[PDB]
From Swiss-Prot, chain D:
Double-stranded RNA (dsRNA) endoribonuclease which cleaves endogenous (endo), exogenous (exo), and viral dsRNAs to produce short interfering RNAs (siRNAs). The generated siRNAs then mediate gene silencing, also called RNA interference (RNAi), by controlling the elimination of endogenous transcripts from mobile and repetitive DNA elements of the genome as well as exogenous RNA of viral origin. Also acts in an RNAi-independent manner to activate translation through cytoplasmic polyadenylation. When in complex with loqs isoform PD (loqs-PD), undergoes significant conformational changes during the full ATP-dependent dicing reaction cycle for processing a 50 bp dsRNA with a 3' two-nucleotide overhang and a 5' monophosphate terminus. At the initial dsRNA binding stage, the helicase and DUF283 domains transition from an extended to a closed conformation, this anchors the bound dsRNA through major and minor groove recognition and forms the ATP- and 5'-phosphate binding pockets required for dicing activity. The gene is Dcr-2. Component of the siRNA-directed RISC loading complex (siRLC), composed of at least Dcr-2, r2d2 and Taf11, which processes dsRNAs into duplex siRNAs which they then load onto AGO2 to initiate formation of the RNA-induced silencing complex (siRISC). The Dcr-2-r2d2 complex exists as a heterodimer and heterotetramer, with the latter showing higher siRNA binding activity. Interacts (via N-terminus) with the siRISC loading cofactor r2d2; interaction is essential for formation of the siRLC and consequently, formation of the siRISC. Interacts with Taf11. Transmembrane segments: none annotated. Belongs to the helicase family. Dicer subfamily. In ovary (at protein level). Changing E42K: Loss of RNAi silencing activity. Decreased processing of dsRNAs into SiRNAs. No effect on mRNA cleavage. Disruption phenotype: Abolishes RNA-induced silencing complex (RISC) assembly and RNAi silencing activity. Abolishes siRNA unwinding prior to loading onto the RNA-induced silencing complex (RISC). Decreased levels of endo-siRNAs. Increased susceptibility to infection with RNA viruses such as Flock House virus, Drosophila C virus or Sindbis virus. No effect on the processing of pre-miRNAs. RNAi-mediated knockdown inhibits the induction of the antifungal peptide Drs in response to M.luteus challenge. Also highly susceptible to infection with A.fumigatus, with 80% of flies dying six days after infection. This is Endoribonuclease Dcr-2. It is found in: Nucleus; Cytoplasm; Cytoplasm, Cytoplasmic ribonucleoprotein granule.
């Protein structure tokens, strides 16, 4: 009846958000059954020279999962958009049922879960703290490795090794003589960063060129220039010199900084031009983590998957709630045997 | 009833997500049909009552 | 609602208050608009000086 | 030291703009325009239809 409020048409309000009931109090506990849901990322783009690394690595069976006290419901296939092309994501409907029987094991799990965010994804903030209250939005992320047979088990060794990413540090020549010589096997499929340059960002080594070696001419645009003298001309004042001048070489590809892969990265990239600046790096001068590349790649997207999963669970809760209200739940289509269909790109939208 | 179809979870996800969150899918297309339905149902209810 | 870290301030001062409104008044600079329940510090300051 | 910093920040400006505006998420709060809230109901009706 009051006529007053027909003046302010564009008001807004503040709201207390809540997590899906599944995500609430989902913290695993010792001596209790916990469920892990493997994450599978199916690239759709065709293999080519430029996108070879992503395609090959993302299809590796070294995936991770999400650990919860509660059983999750079936979740629809999910589209994601990387620089290499579209990505299809699905969550295993069959949980991997495990139980934790040692407090320290849980501690290691949580420590790795913290580490990935704190360092690998760099989502940390100075005021963040590891949560142990087992309350809203309390679930863990654990890597998985093939165990006995087709069954997969927790990557205990990777976690206990990588509690916190080691700090990348260089070495002068004097400490470089007696340092053990690098082995190609120690680098293949690993994660490496170049400490001599100001480039402190992690990046991946694709393949090692054993046949290649320093002092060799550039294959393009620098047939008068070699790796040795060119690296000198660039950062000799920073490296000093190079040892093992004859040993193997490594070929690396940088990792995208983006974390939001929802919207197609529409744009012109000039694949030939961007790939023209081929980079081959001296194994010794680049700090070498022991982390596997494929898991790092599959963890790059983790925030987007987690976010979408959030609202997917919300939507599922609404779906079940409505279907129950209308008494349509008992229908075979909506029964326990529901098979969610893949999400569909709304191509009609301007940004698709 | 033979043409009934399940209420897809992705459809509800599109409904819940707004346009502010720059997602690949949004709510407007479902919102238009919902608006028409709401107007129709309101009209019919009021007239019957 | 205004004596946040009340315990901390009392520990630093070295006294424990039974009635806190006096401390609130003491900490009430005149410019502060919201406080309605007490006058500014000036009244207390006048006696405290002497 | 944190509560001291809090009072100092307030000492600059209490009455007006909410200083939480850029950190609302940390406490699970969010502000939404009324338009979006109205639209989502209609979208749900549309999908159910």
């Amino acid at each position: 009846t009051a006529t007053v409020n027909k003046a302010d048409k564009s008001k807004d309000r503040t709201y207390k958000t809540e997590c899906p009931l599944e995500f609430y109090d989902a913290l695993p506990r010792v001596g209790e059954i916990c469920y892990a849901y493997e994450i599978f990322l199916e690239p759709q783009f065709e293999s080519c020279e430029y996108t070879e690394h992503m395609y090959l690595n993302l299809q590796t069976p070294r995936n991770y999962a999400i650990l919860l006290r509660n059983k999750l419901p079936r979740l629809a296939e999910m589209p994601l958009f990387s620089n290499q092309g579209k990505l299809h994501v699905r969550v295993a409907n069959a949980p991997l049922e495990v139980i934790i029987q040692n407090s320290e094991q849980l501690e290691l799990l949580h420590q790795f879960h913290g580490m990935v965010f704190r360092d690998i994804l760099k989502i940390w903030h100075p005021f963040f703290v590891l949560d142990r209250r087992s309350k809203e939005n309390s679930y863990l992320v654990v890597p998985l490795i093939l165990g006995a047979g087709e069954q997969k088990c927790f990557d205990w060794e990777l976690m206990t090794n990588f509690r916190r990413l080691p700090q990348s540090h260089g070495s002068n020549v004097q400490q470089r003589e007696q340092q053990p010589a690098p082995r190609p096997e120690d680098f293949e499929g690993k994660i490496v960063t170049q400490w001599y340059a100001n480039y402190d960002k992690p990046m991946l080594v694709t393949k090692v060129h054993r046949e290649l070696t320093p002092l060799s001419y550039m294959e393009k645009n620098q047939q008068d220039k070699t790796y040795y003298e060119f690296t000198m001309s660039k950062y000799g004042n920073r490296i000093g010199d190079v040892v093992h001048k004859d040993k193997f070489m490594i070929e690396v590809r940088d990792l995208t900084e983006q974390l939001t892969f929802y919207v197609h990265n529409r744009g012109k990239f000039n694949a030939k031009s961007k790939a023209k600046m081929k980079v081959i790096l001296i194994p010794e001068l680049c700090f070498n983590f022991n982390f596997p590349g494929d898991l790092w790649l599959k963890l790059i997207f983790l925030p987007s998957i987690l976010n979408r999963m959030y609202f997917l669970l919300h939507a599922e809760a609404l779906r079940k709630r409505f279907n129950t209200y209308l008494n349509l739940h008992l229908l075979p289509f909506n029964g326990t045997d529901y098979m969610p269909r893949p999400l569909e790109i709304d191509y009609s939208l301007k940004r698709n | 009833k033979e043409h009934i179809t399940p209420a897809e979870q992705g459809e509800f996800l599109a409904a819940i997500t707004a346009s502010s969150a720059a997602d690949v899918f949004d709510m407007e297309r479902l919102e238009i049909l919902g608006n028409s339905f709401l107007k129709l149902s309101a009209t019919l209810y009021l007239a019957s009552k | 609602g205004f004596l946040i870290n009340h315990y901390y301030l009392e520990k630093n001062l070295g006294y424990t208050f039974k009635d806190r409104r006096y401390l609130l008044q003491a900490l009430t600079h005149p410019s502060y608009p919201t406080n309605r329940i007490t006058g500014s510090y000036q009244e207390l300051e006048f006696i405290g000086n002497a | 030291r944190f509560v001291e910093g809090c009072r100092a920040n307030g000492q600059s400006f209490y009455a007006g703009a909410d200083f939480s505006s850029e950190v609302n998420f940390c406490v699970g709060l969010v502000t939404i325009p009324n338009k979006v809230i109205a639209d989502t109901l209609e979208a749900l009706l549309g999908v159910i239809v």
